[PDB]
Amino acid sequence: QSMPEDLDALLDLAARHGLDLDGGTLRTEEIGLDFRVAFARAHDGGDWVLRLPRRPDVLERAAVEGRLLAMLAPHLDVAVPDWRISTSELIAYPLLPGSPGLTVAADGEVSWHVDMASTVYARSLGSVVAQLHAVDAEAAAATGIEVRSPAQVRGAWRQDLARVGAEFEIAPALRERWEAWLADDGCWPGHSVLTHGELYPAHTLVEDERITAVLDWTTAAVGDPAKDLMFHQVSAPSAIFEVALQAYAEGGGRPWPGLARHCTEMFSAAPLGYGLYALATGEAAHREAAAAALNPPEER
Ligand SMILES: CC[C@H]1OC(=O)[C@H](C)[C@@H](O[C@H]2C[C@@](C)(OC)[C@@H](O)[C@H](C)O2)[C@H](C)[C@@H](O[C@@H]2O[C@H](C)C[C@H](N(C)C)[C@H]2O)[C@](C)(O)C[C@@H](C)CN(C)[C@H](C)[C@@H](O)[C@]1(C)O
Ligand SMILES: CC[C@H]1OC(=O)[C@H](C)[C@@H](O[C@H]2C[C@@](C)(OC)[C@@H](O)[C@H](C)O2)[C@H](C)[C@@H](O[C@@H]2O[C@H](C)C[C@H](N(C)C)[C@H]2O)[C@](C)(O)C[C@@H](C)CN(C)[C@H](C)[C@@H](O)[C@]1(C)O
Ligand SMILES: [Cl-]
Ligand SMILES: [Cl-]
Ligand SMILES: [Cl-]
Ligand SMILES: [Cl-]
């Protein structure tokens, strides 16, 4: 990244919260829509991450995330951020060790740092997800995250299809696929767990193809266990997903026979998530992108 021109203001901000940084090491990532992010070494040599809230309206999501991280860290063997400073103007935590399993460059180039056909990653993922899914769901709920029963998990997808269908044209081929998914009792979970919600390699750190930390916990919710296995299911060979499922069950996870089927159908319903986002933002650019995903053009 880059050396910021407001170095002195950033050092003052950390200093007034008790964090003394070596300004020679300070770099910033400016691309986030909700936070400005800085990395620096402290005077005692430790590496730090700084998150600067851009607007007061991001503080609610940060407060929930902070409560989740505090209660979750004792229950996972892998690392999560340890917020030693959490205020309106600064969130700061030690840099977690390891390298991201997937990085995206400034021009949009995606680079993978672990292969989805790896048995090592498959077993590491299944182990971490079983530990996460074992976390006490009532203590999870007290943090403020959303909570959905198995009944509410299925009903939310049914409602979501209806709401998106009322505001967007949906190609019949996609609508019929998703209706058949929602009608297949074999796909759907019979129990709810604490989930991450976006567990793909960009939100992990890896060492020797094993997960050593999991990041970006804003999507966490009690609900469908498959959400945390679906990205592996759609990207890994089927025998490698089965290695992940075996490690998941070995850790106390309780998969069901149609779980892999469910994962692929669910991933295909991503255009409904785009539609929901557009309706939430109201921004014309998001509505246009969701509309193109919900009603793709014909082949030529
Ligand atoms: C290459 C030269 C630079 O040195 C560095 O950059 C290294 C990271 C490291 O310096 C190198 C190089 C060397 C040869 O010392 C110069 C070596 O003996 C020390 C141990 O690490 C220094 C000692 C860091 O401090 C050490 O950061 C480590 C990550 C952890 C370590 N400790 C806590 C375990 C800690 O002491 C420190 C945090 O910068 C100390 C800080 C108080 C003073 N710095 C601002 C000075 C001025 C540095 O700019 C430097 C000396 O000019
Ligand atoms: C698993 C790998 C893929 O990762 C995914 O599919 C995510 C789960 C997906 O997200 C999925 C799942 C879901 C539920 O988003 C959470 C759905 O709404 C969207 C449409 O697709 C991402 C996060 C979407 O980015 C999200 O777009 C949403 C509309 C809003 C959301 N944020 C702003 C709130 C934003 O992060 C996005 C539109 O794909 C980002 C886009 C710019 C870049 N993609 C094209 C990359 C290359 C992806 O294909 C991927 C990295 O290869
Ligand atoms: Cl951000
Ligand atoms: Cl939230
Ligand atoms: Cl191993
Ligand atoms: Cl869910």
Author numbering: -1 to 298
What does the paper say about this structure?
However, it was evident that the “complex B” encloses the bound macrolide more intimately and more appropriately for catalysis and this complex dominates our analysis. According to the MphH•azithromycin structure, one of these sites, MphHL31 (MphIM40) interacts with azithromycin; MphHL31 faces toward the desosamine and C6–C7 of the macrolactone ring. MphHA200 (MphIP211) is on the short helix α8 that approaches MphHY198, which forms a key hydrophobic packing interaction with the macrolactone ring close to the methyl on C13 and the ethyl group on C14. MphHW155 (MphIT166) is in α6 that lines the macrolide-binding pocket and lies within 6 Å of the cladinose. In the MphH•azithromycin co-structure, the equivalent MphH positions Leu31 and Ala200 do not interact with the C3 cladinose.
Macrolide resistance is abundant in pathogenic bacteria, and is most often the result of GTP-dependent macrolide kinases (Mph), ribosomal methyltransferases, or efflux pumps. Mph enzymes inactivate macrolides by phosphorylating the 2′-OH of the essential dimethylamino sugar, preventing it from binding the ribosome, and providing the chemical rationale for the resistance phenotype.
